[PDB]
């Protein structure tokens, strides 16, 4: 069945996993602006299951119209950017389903985009999903975590402002 009507076992700044999967290095993503931190620094996630979540508590900024990526800004002033796969605007949003709206206030774990990993594995160039801090100028220290993560539960990045 599906489990959202059921209450879940519940719960220096953390950035909780936008997606469930294994961590991969940002420099092991095949797209130079991520691999060399031009647009930001952070990590990628090789996804394992159907939804992307709000990674911190804040406001959604931009969901792109192909619904493969969104930007959000934590009240602790951090702009994170999550982007499923690489060169994904080509799919013209075909496998995504926008769950939220651009000015939307949210909390950690609130769904923003649902996807279809069987179709996307089959069609995207890459499925790895970068999550970077796109306002690196504003931040002091960045510690990246490792291994397995689960959507909305496990931390991936600790920043210190």
């Amino acid at each position: 069945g599906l489990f959202d009507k059921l209450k879940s076992l519940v719960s220096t700044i953390e950035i909780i996993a936008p997606l469930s999967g294994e961590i991969v290095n940002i420099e092991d993503v095949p797209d130079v602006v991520f691999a060399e931190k031009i647009v930001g620094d952070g990590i990628a996630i090789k996804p394992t299951g159907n939804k992307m979540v709000a990674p911190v508590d804040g406001t959604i900024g931009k969901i792109f119209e192909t619904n493969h990526a969104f930007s959000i800004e934590s009240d602790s002033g951090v702009e994170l950017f999550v982007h499923f796969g690489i060169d994904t605007v080509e799919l013209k949003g075909e496998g995504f389903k926008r769950i939220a709206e651009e000015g939307q206030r949210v909390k950690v774990g609130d769904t923003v985009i649902e996807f279809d990993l069987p179709l996307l594995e089959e069609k995207a160039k890459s499925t790895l999903t970068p999550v970077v801090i796109s306002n690196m100028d504003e931040i002091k220290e960045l510690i990246k975590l490792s291994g397995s993560v689960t959507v909305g539960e496990t931390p991936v990045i600790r920043i210190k402002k």
């Binding site: 797209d31 602006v33 031009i38 647009v39 690489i86 060169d87 994904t88 605007v89 080509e90």
Partner: protein, 489 residues
């Protein structure tokens, strides 16, 4: 004291004054007519050009009264390749200025490719067999006047691009001179021998009696009453110099009328295997350096078209606002091949085209798409400058009229994936010609006295839209294919 700069553009004529620091004290600009006699053709009137360039000169000096004896020297920067031929005696031109843009001589370039004279001209000039360059524009003027060539052996008439045109009029006919950067652009000049190539003179049959004395970029060549005329460089080679791109691997892109990207290579002439040109530029004192180049014909001249012929904007400044009213261009592509496609394509017969139209496409989609093609064109030749060099620019130094469009600079940053450095001095083409003049006239004693004036005012980094980069660019790439070889031949 001051140094004066004459900067005679493809569309405007501007004079600008500098003090001993480097400051711009006054800038006068006087725009003039573009003559299109037939569709792929452009022409200016040699007299409308000198009329404007004099007005400006006798306008900066008055604007804040200063004249003849508070001025060290005069530098000359000019638009390249446009050919003029005039009556030595009367100082009257036997035709109009056949502009660099003009496609009129494509048939002569075809005979030159038929002959297998392709590899000779890339080797000895660094250039491509294309209507752009001066060479075959001189053959067309001689082949259309009756008796002009015999009269050219008997010396009654002589050739010149705009730098030698202007200095002749300023020096009552006495001195008739080109510099190295400006001479190289003619296809009649050897870039190795550093003197007029005599096979290139024979195949197009130009009498060597027509040609100028190719002098150097910093050196007093004559006086002017109107006083030492001491500097000359083609406007793209002086913009590289005002940018102090005077050592190898250093580069800049000008978003002027066209987009010209050059990179200093020092003492070596690099063969382009990716559609670029091997030209000549200045080194720290105004000496011959070689450079690598991408020339696109069509940057802000496309915004001139939306304002003057289409009437969609009133100011070119308004392009930023209407372009940022929409968010995307709805699928529309604009290929500004108004005078064929320059680098790296070199297609004389390609014409301008708009693509992907739908009933919901409005005028702001077309305006935004015109601004976008300036950026995509720049990606085409940057991508080529790395394949020819080996270097990978991690920033892009810019200058020009069009760099004041913040949307274009930012869109340029996203489609490229590099930072875009912008100076608070937009006028670096004039400055590059003035430093060039100050040098010869002992006014400055080289570039380190001018290093602390390259403030890089605004910086543009790739925002999160740079992830669309390649998708957006692949639509530009299949759009160009379809504007190619429109004109039948």
């Amino acid at each position: 004291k001051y140094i004066v700069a004459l900067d005679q553009g493809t569309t405007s004529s501007r004079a600008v004054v500098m003090d001993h620091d480097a400051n711009i004290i006054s800038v006068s600009q006087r725009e003039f007519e573009q003559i299109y006699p037939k569709p792929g053709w452009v022409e200016h009137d040699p007299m409308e050009i000198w009329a404007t360039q004099s007005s400006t000169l006798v306008e900066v000096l008055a604007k804040a009264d200063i004249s003849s004896d508070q001025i060290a020297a005069i530098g000359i920067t000019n638009q390249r390749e446009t050919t003029i031929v005039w009556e030595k005696e009367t100082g009257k031109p036997i035709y109009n200025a056949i502009v660099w843009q003009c496609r009129r001589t494509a048939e002569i370039c075809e005979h030159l490719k038929r002959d297998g004279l392709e590899d000779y001209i890339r080797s000895n000039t660094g250039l491509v067999i294309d209507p752009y360059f001066s060479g075959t524009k001189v053959k067309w003027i001689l082949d259309h006047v009756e008796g002009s060539r015999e009269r050219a052996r008997r010396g009654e008439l002589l050739f010149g691009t705009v730098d030698t045109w202007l200095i002749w009029k300023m020096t009552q006919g006495r001195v008739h001179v080109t510099d190295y950067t400006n001479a190289s652009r003619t296809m009649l000049f050897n870039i190795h021998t550093l003197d007029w190539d005599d096979k290139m003179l024979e195949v197009l049959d130009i009498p060597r009696e027509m040609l100028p004395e190719v002098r150097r970029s910093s050196e007093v060549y004559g006086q002017t009453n109107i006083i030492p005329i001491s500097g000359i460089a083609g406007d793209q080679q002086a913009a590289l110099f005002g940018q102090l791109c005077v050592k190898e691997g250093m580069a800049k892109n000008t978003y002027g009328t066209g987009c010209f990207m050059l990179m200093n290579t020092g003492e070596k002439a690099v063969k382009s295997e990716n559609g670029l040109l091997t030209t000549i530029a200045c080194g720290p004192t105004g000496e011959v350096n070689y450079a690598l180049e991408g020339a696109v014909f069509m940057a802000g001249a496309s915004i001139q078209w939306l304002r003057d012929e289409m009437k969609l904007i009133n100011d070119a400044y308004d392009s930023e606002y209407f372009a940022t009213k929409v968010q995307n261009t709805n699928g529309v592509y604009v290929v500004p091949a108004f005078t064929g496609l320059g680098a790296p394509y070199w297609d004389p017969y390609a014409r301008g085209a708009i693509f992907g139209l739908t009933r919901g496409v409005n005028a702001n989609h077309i305006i935004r798409a015109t601004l976008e093609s300036i950026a995509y064109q720049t990606r085409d030749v940057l991508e080529a400058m790395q394949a020819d060099s080996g270097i990978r620019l991690h920033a892009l130094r810019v200058d020009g009229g069009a760099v004041a469009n913040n949307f274009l600079m930012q869109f340029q940053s996203d489609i490229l994936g590099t930072r875009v450095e912008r100076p608070e001095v937009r006028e670096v083409t004039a400055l590059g010609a003035a430093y060039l003049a100050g040098l010869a006239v002992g006014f400055w004693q080289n570039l380190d006295e001018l290093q602390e004036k390259a403030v890089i005012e605004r910086e543009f980094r790739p925002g999160i839209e740079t992830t669309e980069r390649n998708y957006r660019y692949a639509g530009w790439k299949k759009a160009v294919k379809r504007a190619m070889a429109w004109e039948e031949h």
